[PDB]
Design a protein around this ligand. Structure first.
Ligand SMILES: CC(C)[C@H](NC(=O)N(C)Cc1ccccn1)C(=O)N[C@@H](Cc1ccccc1)[C@H](O)[C@@H](O)[C@H](Cc1ccccc1)NC(=O)[C@@H](NC(=O)N(C)Cc1ccccn1)C(C)C
Lengths: 99, 99
């Protein structure tokens, strides 16, 4: 698909059989998801952004599906206001910017 | 061009006669640049993201050029970690996400 940017590029993801929505975000190096309790081992981590840093839990090797496309990678889980799909998973689905 | 996302989608912009690099950012509603003097009057504004809120100055109707394509629109200046080009100007230059 081609997604225009008139509105926020929110799409449906599947994670663990749940559907959710998430923002496709080319300016994020990492993927950050709203608080949830996945199984698995985590590491603590701090990620930063516009106003500062928050604390998150890092899970590795998580499979997410983005508009029917699979990707497998690290996900950070924390008190984010929005689910963010970053470049580590966008590359896997062949996603480009074009103009 | 077509930009892949294996690395950060930094490009060169020209603004107020300077060259800067900025991040092409589909997850941002707005464009935020590092502190600089632009000509023009401005309004104080607040914007947020991960981490919280920062206070910026809003300049309207600013000409900026992004990889040789012109855009005229609102630019916020303030203590951002990185120069961000958001969706208000990506749409002007015809930017889409594709996969
Ligand atoms: C999620 C983090 C892990 C991420 N950080 C990150 O990737 N790094 C710190 C590494 C790095 C360093 C240098 C260059 C690139 N990357 C981040 O916040 N990235 C930003 C851009 C940025 C990078 C580095 C420093 C500072 C900023 C995202 O790409 C950017 O799109 C965010 C995404 C976002 C949206 C909502 C809430 C939290 C985060 N938007 C923003 O921060 C903008 N805000 C908004 O657009 N809104 C709040 C509106 C909104 C509301 C709801 C939904 C979407 N958007 C700012 C720039 C105005």
């Amino acid at each position: 698909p081609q997604i225009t940017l008139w509105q926020r590029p929110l799409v449906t993801i599947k994670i663990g059989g749940q559907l959710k929505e998430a923002l496709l975000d080319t300016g994020a190096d990492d993927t950050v998801l709203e608080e949830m309790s996945l199984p698995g081992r985590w590491k603590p981590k701090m990620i930063g952004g516009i106003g500062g840093f928050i604390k998150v839990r890092q899970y590795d090797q998580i499979l997410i599906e983005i508009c029917g496309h699979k990707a497998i990678g690290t996900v950070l889980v924390g008190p984010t206001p929005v689910n963010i799909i970053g470049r580590n998973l966008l590359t896997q689905i062949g996603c480009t910017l074009n103009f």
